[PDB]
Design a binder for this molecule. Sequence first.
Ligand SMILES: CC[C@H](C)[C@H](N)C(=O)OP(=O)(O)OC[C@H]1O[C@@H](n2cnc3c(N)ncnc32)[C@H](O)[C@@H]1O
Ligand SMILES: [Zn+2]
Length: 917
Amino acid sequence: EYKDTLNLNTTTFSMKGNLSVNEPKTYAKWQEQQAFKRMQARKDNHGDFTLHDGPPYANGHLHLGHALNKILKDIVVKREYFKGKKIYYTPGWDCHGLPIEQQILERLEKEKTSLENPTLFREKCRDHAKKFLEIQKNEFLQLGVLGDFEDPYKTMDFKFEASIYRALVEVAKKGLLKERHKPIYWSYACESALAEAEVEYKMKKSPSIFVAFGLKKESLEKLKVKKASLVIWTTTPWTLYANVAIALKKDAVYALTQKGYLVAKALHEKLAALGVVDNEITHEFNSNDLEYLVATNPLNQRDSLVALGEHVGLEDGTGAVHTAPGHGEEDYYLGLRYNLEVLMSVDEKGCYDEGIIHNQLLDESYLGEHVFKAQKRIIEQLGDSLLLEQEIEHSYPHCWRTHKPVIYRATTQWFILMDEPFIQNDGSQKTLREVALDAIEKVEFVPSSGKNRLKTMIENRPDWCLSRQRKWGVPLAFFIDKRTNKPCFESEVLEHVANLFEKKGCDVWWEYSVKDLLPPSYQEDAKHYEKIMHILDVWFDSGSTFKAVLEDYHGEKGQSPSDVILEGSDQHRGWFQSSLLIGCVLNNQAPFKKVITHGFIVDEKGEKMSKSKGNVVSLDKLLKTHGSDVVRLWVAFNDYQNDLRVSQTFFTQTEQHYKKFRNTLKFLLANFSDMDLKNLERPHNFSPLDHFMLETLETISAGVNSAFEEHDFVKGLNILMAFVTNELSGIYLDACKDSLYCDSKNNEKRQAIQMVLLATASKLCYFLAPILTHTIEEVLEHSQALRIFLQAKDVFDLKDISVSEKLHLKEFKKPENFEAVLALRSAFNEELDRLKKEGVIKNSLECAIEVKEKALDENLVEELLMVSFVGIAKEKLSETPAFTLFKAPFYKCPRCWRFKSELENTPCKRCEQVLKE
Ligand SMILES: CC[C@H](C)[C@H](N)C(=O)OP(=O)(O)OC[C@H]1O[C@@H](n2cnc3c(N)ncnc32)[C@H](O)[C@@H]1O
Ligand SMILES: [Zn+2]
């Protein structure tokens, strides 16, 4: 009957998050109130921070990977904002290319329709990108992220298309944009060249065959043998029609078997065990003496030159390599080395064309057949020359959006050259590969291992094929002079076109005549010029975002180079590399100072998610079930630099952490809710325990901050959680509960406790604000004391505070040392544990302790162990080397339940006083 005489100590801040209901209201408010613009306009901004957004493709709804990405960017940006900086973060969308165009192509199929008008086709692509840009923008905002989402950048904006073109212009004028004719990746499904970032290597089954090419009569006579046939190994019977040579290893021994097969001696043992060749060797020859002999192709009876390759391998195959210059890059260079024909009779759709008849390379029945469908019939046609057929599996390149296997076709395309010296901005001379490698060494990678991934790619990469044979993209908008057969790179022409794109967009390249695309100076010679109609690799679009966004807006959307970029691990093959290369051409450095890489969302078994496999976890369902602040906490509280597995068990762990933080903030708010805000002006006498908590708060705050500075949010959250769980809840709040609930509101020691709780909630708000922004906004909404103490209207006014200044602490105050008393506490609690299960007592408050160590502050002992008496009493309960435990020789107080009453059912002296107030 004393419960209503206690301090109420409640807050309107609720235990339950109600996140599905409350979070949309917060995020809608931030949109309506233009919170991001308010952040940028903050009057006392000091220093600048630029995160340059890498642009997601404007196709589809968001998945959990996009959420991971944008949430990490948001934590990084909000950290810098709350450190006091002016922030720049303009999100963007990647609107061109097959990620958009393939969806139009597939829908036209399903509807059984076609769209051949270029302007109308580009319009359907553009409308699709516009549609999903808005969908994605709103789904991003539902995660609580803040950026310039009402003014995002778009690669389909006319000014951006011009910026991309002007970047290409800079490459051309530095001498790095050149035509090459060679075999390259070819996607037959979309009738386009491809480069590396547009291929996905996947396991594929293939025929694997060993084929005898008999030496011609005159070559047998020169070699002085009766029978000899070189054996080749190939997995592509579809290229045998284009054979012109058989390449051997230089200065290497070739064995001739009794049945007359000629293979590398080093491989004969393996080949005979396979049954490709017979076991007996009759003669050995040096490949140097075999060069310029001639064999016969069993498929079509054509000559095949015996040639010497560069670096022919002896781990695979036979040591004799079927050479088809039209369908292999190294083959092509060998063919030119020996002035051989480049046979290439495979069209843009991957089908054999009339060249096989004109050149007598393959039977006419194959005309129009797809090369992969023809292979079975080709293999059957080989007859006795087929020595062995297997089926193998190997990693094979596939088109990134049609998912069909690619082939290689000799073709003329446009490239950025990697090993071509060009004039540096400082006047020196270096190749792009050299510049990029030097640039990488100036970039910080998080984790540092990511440097090695990008560096190895730059060390090994080939020339970058830029030209694509689709319509949705930025054209390589140069004219060829027919009088010279070379491109026109005159600045007046290039600037004229760039200005037209900036005002009208690239549709004009298809619509306008050559004369109408030329400056008036040139229009009389318009008859001599023809347009290049190829469009740029979409990876060149996105590689140019630093120029189009950071440079062309002169710092208004962030500096070049950016301070941070942050993307998934596939962007070393992608956007990190394209942006590095273009930045090194234009600026001779990377357009970013730091690269943070995150892993991929994968299922509970570590496997990739796909609608095909049935293992896709829905972002919308995840948000509905847990709320965005829980999804955000899951991101921050996990090892995001490696792949992240999604499962109910891991989200249940995160929910328990969120509940612990939330329940802690509720308790804090409840227990300084009644404090007279005049307290905030005056200093207080703090107890040793108070000081221990303030000093501990400062030590853990430094550790959290250092961890968050290194982007190790797990480490920082673990420090914060341990403080919340152990020192705060376990030690301080337990020890303070009596004063908080049972001491007078005027009690100066209670007021000091409340100031410690205020300072503690203040630091929790500051450190959690980048991660749980909605929840900290809610905390401030419900606590007038915090808003006054922090001079904060809302979460966007938070700053790191000096607890020392706010609480008026003395400069040279010597820290508490609690090692001895906390060791006594743990030892007492272990002994109390044992007495409880024996039934000897129920609670620490029933006990008296006499400590043999006279050196300890006895009131601190009583405070920390929550005994009701320090000293000697009558009934001995137990004894250790450090202390003796007795039953407290008092009654339980009916108001505070401490054993401090001299009379049964009578308020103790403290409570008596409080009740009389
Ligand atoms: C930087 C984007 C470039 C230019 C390109 N448009 C692109 O890849 O766009 P998108 O495919 O939509 O991806 C945009 C960003 O999401 C990241 N991402 C994609 N899938 C996943 C996934 N399962 N798990 C985690 N992250 C993912 C990707 O790593 C990039 O950080
Ligand atoms: Zn009492």
